[PDB]
């Protein structure tokens, strides 16, 4: 996984500036964790963190989980 | 006397969450609570209904406690929400009534001289009718017989005002039938007729079988109405019975194959015009 | 699985990920559906030589969509 | 923390029922009365019961929620047997629509200063048309929150099912003051059976026999509207190269009550004799 | 109770029943709601008679519709 780890973040790009600062952040949180799953690459979640922090609540916790 | 007593499902559904919230905690029998209604020519509608904290004892069958002040002070709270509302009997949960309820319902008379308490059997679902309206009657009994306080049965049954109505048509919104009925629910309610018409023998019966066994007295009265029962019997194989029978089932009859042979000219040409539309399609595939 | 039988961690995880219209927080659930789409090349217990193998991709190829 | 869009409010079938007998009963006048039960968890608010409360002059209005008869009901009703707690209070609007105005502001703030989850419970008793019970649910979200970048509820589920809100509650600032609460009524076995006893046909009732000189009139004229409707269906059917539908209704009703009626005289001949 | 439910998943240990048991017996709602799935997944394909036995006796005792 780690060795051919290849996450188009483009597509991530043009959805995060796509959100309306509606709940959906909360599935953007698991859908990049999607695209990352088992490959310890939280390069969006590193570049990106005002808006992960601007989610909180039960937000947090799916963050979290989503880091793990 | 009353003719009718007409019982809005409020009532029920109230002595429903009366009898849950009770026997959740305190196991008992029957619980007690008193009838409010509007009255009529002579026919009494139960609308509204409230709880009042009774106690019993099964010994002695008269160590009870019925409020007085609570059935007072429930009755001025609901009078102030709605004075339409009088007290017009009083109801428990028991599905028999037991040797107490003449001082209870003595009681409700001193509140109500026409009172009439309905026993709302609860716990059981069964055929139809949960609620059973009784009156105290006191007579010399007529026929030279000892006096007693007797309860005599007035029928009753299950009415509905608009808010209620629509309140229990969406309550339910999951196993409503429909009102057209079609002919599947007729047959339904056939049978349910049926069962009933078997379950009412089969209690009269019983009733027989004690009274003949000695274990119940001979009423010698109302007996022969159910006498009368015996000889309203319609006498079927009679030949003026039978010939006009066989006309109205053959007047039917033509009715009924008339309408089948229009159904089927209908499906025959249904399925000549989707044999058409098919070939119509498979030649203009090409 | 590879040899036809049923994964387990891969149906429990797609049912609790199913369960999210009650629970969010199931949705990471779905990892355990996922299954490597992977070949080895391990001969030995600690070796992994450079091996040459190619494909048959007959008209042309694929896999890796888009940028 | 934040409440939650799947919180919902478990009505009782008695309570819904209460509540529209008052609405009806105090219709054009607006009603009022409190809404007994329990909170039980974050996520539900159970309302068991409710009772009415005596109609004042001033409507539905902090001023009109007499403590006297509240307490005393209150704890007498608890001397009966039933402990609940206020959980919120229901209200009637005939021919509003459900939603909160702002007497009905005053009086949720002055709710949630005892309790903090208390729910205001909107009805509208002359809109609660046959096959519609038109019923909402609502609490107040201060502006503090809303204004300074936080959603009012989180969504932590799916939950949110409820369907785009009556535009009435829009124009009335449905979620600017007052989030609504998504609506679950509660019923039980035995109460469903014995609401059901109501409209239920009596067991004589499938044993009579409809009025035999009735049968053969309506006979009669169905028979001649299928008459017309051959010559009609002959009409359309010849000028091809809606009948159909009329006399497939038309047989349909035929066949099920002259089948019905045969059924029944079949059954009452072998049943009584 | 949700991550040591699921790492345990299938390992049948006593241990972690119990504690989950006491955990679903806490009847705190979301805790509740975590514990079923944890003592689910701990119990995963087990067909322990005590635990299903349990887990029913809770089910039609509860309130707390989340915990269902
Ligand atoms: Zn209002």
């Given at each position: 996984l780690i060795r051919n780890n290849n996450t188009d973040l483009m597509i991530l790009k043009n959805t995060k500036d796509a959100?309306?600062?509606?709940?959906?952040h909360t599935a953007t949180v698991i859908a990049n964790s999607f695209m990352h799953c088992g490959t310890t690459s939280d390069q969006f979640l590193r570049d990106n963190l005002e808006w992960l922090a601007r989610a909180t609540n039960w937000a947090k916790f799916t963050a979290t989980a989503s880091l793990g | 006397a009353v003719q009718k007593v007409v019982v809005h499902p409020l009532v029920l559904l109230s002595v429903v969450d009366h009898f849950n919230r009770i026997g959740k905690?305190?196991?008992?029998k029957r619980v007690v609570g008193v009838l409010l209604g509007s009255w009529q020519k002579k026919v009494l509608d139960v609308s509204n209904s409230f709880a009042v904290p009774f106690d019993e004892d099964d010994?002695?069958?008269?160590?009870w406690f019925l409020d007085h002040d609570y059935l007072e002070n429930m009755y001025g709270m609901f009078k102030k929400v709605?004075?339409?509302?009088?007290?017009?009997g009083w109801y428990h949960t028991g599905p028999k009534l037991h040797k107490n309820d003449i001082a209870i319902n003595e009681l409700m008379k001193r509140y109500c001289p026409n009172s009439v308490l309905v026993i709302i059997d609860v716990k059981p679902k069964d055929l139809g009718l949960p609620t059973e309206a009784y009156i105290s009657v006191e007579e010399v009994?007529?026929?030279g017989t000892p006096t007693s306080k007797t309860f005599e049965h007035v029928t009753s049954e299950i009415g509905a005002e608009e808010a209620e109505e629509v309140g229990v048509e969406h309550l339910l919104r999951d196993i409503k039938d429909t009102t057209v009925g079609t002919l599947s629910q007729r047959i339904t309610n056939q049978v349910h007729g049926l069962k009933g018409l078997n379950s009412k023998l089969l209690d009269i019966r019983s009733y027989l079988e004690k009274v003949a066994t000695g274990?119940?007295?001979?009423?010698?009265?109302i007996i022969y109405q159910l006498q009368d029962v015996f000889n309203?019997?319609?006498?079927?194989?009679?030949q003026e019975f039978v010939k006009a029978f066989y006309l109205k089932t053959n007047d039917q009859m033509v009715v009924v194959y008339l309408a089948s042979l229009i159904r089927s000219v209908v499906a025959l040409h249904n399925l000549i015009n989707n044999k058409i539309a098919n070939r119509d399609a498979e030649k203009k595939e090409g | 699985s590879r040899t036809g039988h049923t994964h387990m961690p891969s149906v429990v995880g797609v049912l609790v990920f199913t369960?999210?219209?009650?629970?969010?927080?199931?949705?990471?659930?779905?990892?355990?559906?996922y299954t490597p789409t992977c070949v080895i090349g391990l001969n030995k217990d600690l070796k992994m030589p450079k091996v040459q193998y190619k494909s048959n991709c007959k008209p042309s190829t694929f896999a890796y969509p888009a940028p | 923390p934040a409440v939650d869009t799947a919180e919902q409010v478990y009505i009782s079938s008695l309570a819904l029922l209460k509540m529209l007998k008052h609405g009806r009963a105090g219709v054009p006048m607006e009603v009022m009365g409190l809404m007994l039960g329990?909170?039980?968890?974050?996520y539900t608010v159970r309302v068991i019961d409710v009772f009415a409360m005596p109609q004042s002059?001033?409507?539905?209005?902090?001023?009109?929620?007499?403590p006297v008869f509240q307490a005393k009901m209150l704890d007498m009703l608890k001397q009966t047997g039933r402990p609940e707690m206020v959980v919120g209070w229901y209200h009637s609007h005939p021919g509003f629509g459900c939603w909160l105005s702002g007497v009905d502001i005053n009086t949720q703030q002055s709710f949630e200063?005892?309790?903090?989850?208390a729910v205001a419970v909107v009805v509208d008793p002359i809109q609660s048309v046959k096959g519609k019970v038109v019923i909402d649910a609502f609490r107040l979200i201060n502006a503090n929150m809303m204004v300074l970048?936080?959603?009012?509820?989180?969504?932590?589920?799916?939950?949110?099912?409820?369907?785009?809100?009556?535009i009435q509650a829009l124009i009335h600032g449905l979620n600017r003051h007052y989030y609504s609460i998504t609506i679950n009524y509660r019923k039980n076995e035995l109460e469903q059976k014995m609401l059901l006893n109501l409209h239920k046909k009596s067991w004589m009732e499938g044993l009579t026999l409809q009025d035999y000189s009735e049968h053969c009139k309506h006979n009669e004229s169905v028979v001649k509207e299928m008459l017309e409707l051959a010559k009609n269906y002959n009409k359309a059917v010849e000028e091809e190269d809606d009948p159909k539908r009329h006399l497939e209704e038309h047989v349909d009703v035929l066949m099920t009550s002259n089948i019905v009626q045969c059924l029944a005289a079949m059954l009452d001949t072998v049943v009584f004799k | 109770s949700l991550g040591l439910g699921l790492a345990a998943?299938?390992?049948?240990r006593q241990d972690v029943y119990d504690l989950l048991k006491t955990n679903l017996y806490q009847d705190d709602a979301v805790t509740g709601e975590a514990a079923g799935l944890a003592l689910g997944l701990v119990m995963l394909?087990?067909?322990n008679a005590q635990a299903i036995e349990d887990m029913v006796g809770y089910a039609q005792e509860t309130q707390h519709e989340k915990i269902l």
């Open positions: 959100v309306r600062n509606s709940v959906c | 905690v305190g196991n008992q010994k002695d069958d008269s160590v709605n004075a339409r509302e009088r007290i017009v009994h007529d026929d274990k119940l007295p001979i009423n010698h009265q309203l019997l319609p006498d079927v194989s009679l | 369960q999210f219209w009650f629970w969010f927080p199931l949705s990471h659930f779905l990892s355990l559906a | 329990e909170f039980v968890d974050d002059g001033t409507g539905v209005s902090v001023e009109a929620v007499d200063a005892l309790s903090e989850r970048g936080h959603e009012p509820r989180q969504t932590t589920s799916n939950l949110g099912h409820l369907n785009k809100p009556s | 998943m299938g390992t049948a394909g087990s067909k």
